[PDB]
């Protein structure tokens, strides 16, 4: 929505920090699966 995200199952605002926390936990293997070179 505009420049921000929403999560709905019941709807919440998804902040960049929450996304950062989630992404920081993602592993190298998951990055390769996602097609992103972790290095």
Partner 1 sequence: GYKFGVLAKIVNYMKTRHQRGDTHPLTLDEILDETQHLDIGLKQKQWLMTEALVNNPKIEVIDGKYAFKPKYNVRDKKALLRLLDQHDQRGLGGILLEDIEEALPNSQKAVKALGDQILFVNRPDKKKILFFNDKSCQFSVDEEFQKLWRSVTVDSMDEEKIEEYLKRQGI
Partner 2 sequence: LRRNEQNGAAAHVIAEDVKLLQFHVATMVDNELPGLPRAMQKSGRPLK
The reply on whether position 21 binds partner 1 by CB under 8 A is yes
The reply on whether position 26 binds partner 1 by CB under 8 A is no
Q: Which two tokens stand for residue 33?
A: 């699966």
Helix (H) / strand (E) element for 33: namely helix 28-33
Sole residue written with tokens 């605002």:
13
Q: Are 5 and 14 in contact (CB under 8 A)?
A: yes
CB nearer partner 1, residue 13 or residue 36:
13
CB nearer partner 1, residue 8 or residue 17:
17
The item of partner 1, partner 2, none sharing an interface with residue 21, based on CB under 5 to 8 Å by kind, is: partner 1
């Amino acid at each position: 929505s505009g420049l921000e995200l929403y999560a709905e199952w019941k709807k919440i605002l998804l902040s960049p920090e929450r996304v950062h926390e989630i992404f920081k936990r993602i592993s190298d293997e998951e990055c390769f699966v996602l097609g992103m070179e972790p290095r």
